[PDB]
Each structure stands twice: as C-alpha cells, then as structure tokens.
C-alpha cells in the first residue's frame, strides 16, 4: 500500500495570502494525485487531478505540482471561500489512500459576540425540564469563555456548548451554551446569567434574566 502524508494539519491565513499544503507518498505515484476541498459536512469537491489539472470551474489560484513522491497544492491569494479541509489522494494502485487533511481557517479582525439568553419555555417546564439557552454569535477569534451564573453562583455542570464552523461570508464564529436544570431546581432560584469572556474585552459580556419577568 502507498501511504500519503499530508502536512501541516492546520493553517490560519489572511485573505490575499499564499498557502502551501504538502503531500508525500511512500512510493512513486507517478503524478496520479488528486486534491479535494471539503466544507463542513458536505461531500468533498474535486479541485485538482493528475497532479496539475484544474477541475472545471475551479479558479486559477489553486495550483498543484509534484512528481515521484513529493507533491504540493498552493492557494495563491486566498479568498474567504477557501476555508475547509483539503485532502490529497493517490490513484496509482489499490488501495487508494487519502492524506490526513489540512484544516484552513481565514484570519480576520477580532469581533465580539452578540449574546442572547433565553428562559426555559412553558413547554419544557411542563415536561419538568428547564433549559436556559445562551447564544454568543459572530465573534472572531474562536476562543471564548462562558461562565454560567445562577444567583451569582457559577455552575460547572449540565452545560453544553457547541461551536459553528467559520462563516463563509464574514469569517466569523458562533456558539451556543445550554444549561439544563429540572423545573424545580430552576424555580428554586432567580438570576440566571451567561457571561462571555472573550479576548476582545477585559470585562465580561454578561447577559442575565430574572425568573418572573418578561
């Protein structure tokens, strides 16, 4: 089997930059190499084939080269659309092999989250559930901190966070935070708080709500 080694595993680059992704084969693959771009849980898309040939409608800024066992893909003048993973694959013998992938993120100016705290809806209350949901949308960079404060007391349980891939348009990230309690545990308190700790500030972006108001 010919093993493919892709490097680096990740890249961060600004619009206009040049990115070099490498792929090494453990045996000569005689120019039988393809490159794919993959956006968040969508089917991989063929970019380049037979080492150097661009697939129809792939822009000229993509450029593959190599021979033997050494191959490369360069993105000259990156565009926001270029985020995602890239994979190389040899087509020389069977088994075919994919390199491990490269996750490319576009850098952009820092931007602070816009937060929204949501009280549990009647429907859940009835079920005996109490999920407090907080959205921190459109922030860059990806690192953000969220403290959950129930009556000033910070919680470190029953909280679920989930991030978004980078946004195709403004290259931004978004996140959700869900604190789930049992209806009674919930009714047993009054100030519910979501406190965002993000690089763009020295003072937490706090959002709170009170159990008996609208």
């Amino acid at each position: 089997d010919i093993q493919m080694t892709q490097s680096p595993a990740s890249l961060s680059a600004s619009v206009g930059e040049t990115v070099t992704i490498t792929c090494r084969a453990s045996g000569n693959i005689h120019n039988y190499l393809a490159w794919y771009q993959q956006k968040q849980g969508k089917s991989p898309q063929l970019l380049v084939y037979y080492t150097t040939t661009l697939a129809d409608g792939v822009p000229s800024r993509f450029s593959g080269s190599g021979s033997g066992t050494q191959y490369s893909l360069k993105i000259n003048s990156l565009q926001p659309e270029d985020f995602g993973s890239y994979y190389c694959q040899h087509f020389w013998s069977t088994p075919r092999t994919f390199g491990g992938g490269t996750k490319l993120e576009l850098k952009r100016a820092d931007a602070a989250p816009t937060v929204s705290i949501f009280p549990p809806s009647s429907e859940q209350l009835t079920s005996g559930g109490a999920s407090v949901v907080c959205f921190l949308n459109n922030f860059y960079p990806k690192d953000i901190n969220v403290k959950w404060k129930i009556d000033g007391s910070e919680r470190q349980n029953g909280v679920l966070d989930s991030w978004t891939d980078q946004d195709s348009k403004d290259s931004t990230y978004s996140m959700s935070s869900t604190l789930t309690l049992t209806k009674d545990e919930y009714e047993r308190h009054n100030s519910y708080t979501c406190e965002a700790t993000h690089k763009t500030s020295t003072s937490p972006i706090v959002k709170s709500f009170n159990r008996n108001e609208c």
Partner: protein, 218 residues
Amino acid sequence: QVQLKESGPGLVAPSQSLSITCTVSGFSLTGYGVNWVRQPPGKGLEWLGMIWGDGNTDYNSALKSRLSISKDNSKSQVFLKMNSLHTDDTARYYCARERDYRLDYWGQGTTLTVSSASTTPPSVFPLAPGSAAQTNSMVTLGCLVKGYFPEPVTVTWNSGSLSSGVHTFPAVLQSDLYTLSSSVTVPSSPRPSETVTCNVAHPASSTKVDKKIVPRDC
C-alpha cells in the same frame, strides 16, 4: 444530472452486519468505477474499496475480511456489505464516481451510527426573547431540539424561506441523546407581527415538528 445517492439503515447494533446501496443516475456503471469512502465524525476520509467498470473489485487492506462490494449494471446499483460492525464503524458513508483516475461526483452521504441505544424523536421548544428585546433593530429567536437519537436532524426556518442569519449548531451527545439548537436573527419589523416557524425533521423517527416562535406573553 449525474447523481449518486446512498441509502442505508442509520443505526445498527454492534456485532451486526451493514448493507448500504448506492443508486446512480445519469451514467452507466460499465464505463465508470464507483469507490466507497467513509468519514468518521471529526476525522479524515478513509477509502473502503471500489468496483471498476469491468466488475473487478478492490478493498482496503484492513477491511478486506469484513467487506464485500458488488453491483448491478442493469439496476444502476453498487452495494457495500460490512460484517461484524463495531462502534468505530460509525461514520458518514459515501459512494463516488471515478471518471478516469479522479472522483468527480460524490453522493451526499449517509450517516451510520453504530449503537445499542435507540431511536428517540426530538423534543422541539421555541426560544422567544422577553419584552425587553423589541427595542433593538433586530431580534434573535431560536429552537431547542432536545433528547433525540440517532443523528441527523434537519432544522429549517419558515419552510426554508428564512436562510439569512440562521446559525444551526452541531448536535452534542449528552447520554445517548442529542441536543441541537438553531438561532435566526430577523429585523424587529417582522416578528411578532409576522410569523416565524422552526421546522425540525428527524428522519430516523418519521418526526416532522413545526414550532411557531410566539412572544412570551407574560
């Protein structure tokens, strides 16, 4: 026009067998090869095997003993059979058309969850603001899709007519149950005056929930 569509069971218990069909359209299986590729959650692409135009098949060295590939040129079907599954076989499965040493058309893929846990429909709740909120130029609404299994779920706004400012967040697995949420941001001119609905579908359950984001009138 060229289309590859895969179909499989979504959930299987460990130690069982899996059978996935790839139905092709717009081309004939005698002139192209069909490859099978799998993607474990958060991992890279892994080649499973292939069937060439001439019926010859090739398999991944490590799965050679559990795998079988075959087709029906007449029926436009390629079939993958994997014996003795493990949880590690959980991945999104794809069939892709090989046109002269390049995979040019890929199927949408089919998620396969290898577990003993069971189908549970989602519980959909609206996420409405509070009186405080209509003072800003725009409002963010939401949908909680709690305790469902297995993945995936499709969340849509206003039957797909609301695509801008929609953020759907990937599912998180608590205890054999998934929780997902999505937010949509709309101009304060529209909600509440105009209706905003969150259509949530869970295929694995024949669940098709629609929820109207109504103002918390309290």
